[PDB]
Design a protein around this ligand. Structure first.
Ligand code: NAD
Ligand code: NAD
Lengths: 311, 308
């Protein structure tokens, strides 16, 4: 039995049916504080900041694995750091301790490039590097990785984690992160409208398409234990680009659309992060691989967003 | 008005009178969940894990600065990680939130070499380095440094911190800490008794004497917030030695001294930390300096422990 927390978000909306198709709708339990249609898959209300709720869910459903997605992202976290701390820090601790106290075999946590800071090298950064995040989100996430590793080394609890770069998708709309523009821009492109970008035109960041993000999280989940040396904090990425570069590439398909740059607080967050990641450890230790390069995700996004908007 | 949490500990026992001496007795307030003699200075019971208590104290005593010493150390943290997380993680968060809410203009947190892990270079480690701690204590402490820097960059709360190595002292009794062997060994030596050390004979670690530890904490506290760039995570040390090295030096003064090694979980903790630290940043930014080398610390300890 697999429990997914924070399943109503950008990733969860697709991870739940992804897990269901692979292991059976019957073996997956979706959960969040906000319910959304999960197409037949069981959904339960679960606030991760409430230890009692986690215990009850794990007990009732004899949970064997937890994909812990629940959390307040980078941007939203800066608007309410107290909320981010409660949900991300105490919530992750609750999940780890609950898993340990019960018979949960594995816990998989999606960390982020948000664990990096100004001192972190900007190009092809490895997994073991300087981690001095400057956002509440980042502090709770590096803490989660360390707590995760500690629960394995101390209690033998199989906790694994990877660091996601910006995730691009079309099924569920991102709203609380810093890399959200990479999705928003497609809507404006397909409608031939002028997109107002909140990141600087040359703000380079690592990114990846949802299909690969889902595959990576599940591949890490299924990875052989004997090769998991790093175990927590695996850098994962597909490509790096700036807003002006993505605009230009989309332009190659849709010439009648434009962009303007009006940077806000999110650009300041992005400035503290690295431009590209080295994902060699993930590939060497559990076979991480990318199937969608930039061109392929751009064309796939245009196709699906165009159908969604009735274009 | 300066508030000190965890004032009854090894550091607090000495920092309080140190503060009263420099800033006046009526300007210091001691606090802890366990009371000890404060030689007149006001003392109040305060559980840092209870946010409401912190708020009342800061409000009632018009606290302007906080030296946050309360916490669970490395060894005890491994014996009870849940307690370490509760008082260290939640406690420090409570202090920061309370400081941010009210009118607190300065908060000083004593971090530790415990924030380092196996990947951290072993020699002359600079402050900006790999920090992947493997103890619950270490996890809570690197989080403390990060939350601190965050509150400063986000809310302007003047939070500063330095990373203490093992601290040697005679005032307070040792508490079986990972580096407390450096204190216990003196009790046994002065009695000419064979000491049973729990760290490996060649387990090198950075250390420093209490007088310098106190001076460093206050020098950091008195620094002009404009001069501080690193601000949090300042590596600080006086010297590096191994148990066999300290034993040898002590034996030069007390030749009948004997020692045997029975390593335990604390040696495994120590093995994950660096051997020596580069403290250039502390010296360049707020003038960090050492006045007690290893010899003076050894002779001074022997003198005091003999007296009791
Ligand atoms: N999307 C990305 O580009 C990206 C990148 C790196 C890391 N991540 C990580 O992936 C996870 C989810 O990402 P996402 O993009 O789907 O986020 P999202 O903002 O789309 O969804 C987050 C979900 O968390 C839920 N939630 C908030 N508080 C909760 C609580 N107390 N209990 C249970 N649920 C709660 C929300 O209701 C929401 O459905 C997070 O841990 C995030 O840090 C995402
Ligand atoms: N002593 C060292 O060598 C050393 C080295 C590096 C960092 N530090 C840091 O210095 C600080 C204190 O060190 P120490 O050696 O004096 O520790 P200590 O163990 O001697 O004292 C800690 C104090 O914390 C108190 N305490 C525990 N829970 C509390 C709570 N909920 N509310 C208030 N007080 C509580 C204890 O009762 C105790 O008096 C800690 O933050 C520690 O991590 C110490």
């Amino acid at each position: 039995m697999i429990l997914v927390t924070g399943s109503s978000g950008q990733i969860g909306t697709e991870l739940v049916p992804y897990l269901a198709e692979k292991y059976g709708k019957k073996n997956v339990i979706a959960s969040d504080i906000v319910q959304r249609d999960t197409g037949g898959i069981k959904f339960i209300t679960l606030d991760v900041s409430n230890r009692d709720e986690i215990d009850r869910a794990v007990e009732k459903y004899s949970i064997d694995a937890i994909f812990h997605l629940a959390g307040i992202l980078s941007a939203k976290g800066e608007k309410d750091p107290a909320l981010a701390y409660k949900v991300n820090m105490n919530g992750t601790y609750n999940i780890l301790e609950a898993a340990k106290q019960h018979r949960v075999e594995k816990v998989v946590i999606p960390s982020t490039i948000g664990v990096f800071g100004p001192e972190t090298p900007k190009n092809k950064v490895p997994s073991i590097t300087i981690t001095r995040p400057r956002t509440m989100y980042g502090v709770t996430k590096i803490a989660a990785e360390l707590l995760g590793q500690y629960y394995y080394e101390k209690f033998g609890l199989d906790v694994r984690s990877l660091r996601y770069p910006g995730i691009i998708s079309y099924k569920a709309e991102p709203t609380a992160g810093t890399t959200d523009y990479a999705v928003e821009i497609f809507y404006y492109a397909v409608k031939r409208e002028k997109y107002k970008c909140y990141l600087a035109p040359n703000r380079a960041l690592p990114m990846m398409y949802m299909p690969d993000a889902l595959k990576a999280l599940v591949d890490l989940y299924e990875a052989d234990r004997d090769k998991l040396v790093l175990r927590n904090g695996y850098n994962v990425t597909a490509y790096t680009f700036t807003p002006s570069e993505l605009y230009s590439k989309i332009k190659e398909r849709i010439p009648e659309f434009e962009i303007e740059y009006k940077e806000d607080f999110r650009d300041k967050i992005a400035a503290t992060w690295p431009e590209s990641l080295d994902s060699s450890e993930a590939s060497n230790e559990w076979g991480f691989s990318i199937e969608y390069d930039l061109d392929r995700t751009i064309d796939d996004m245009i196709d699906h967003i165009s159908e969604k908007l009735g274009i």
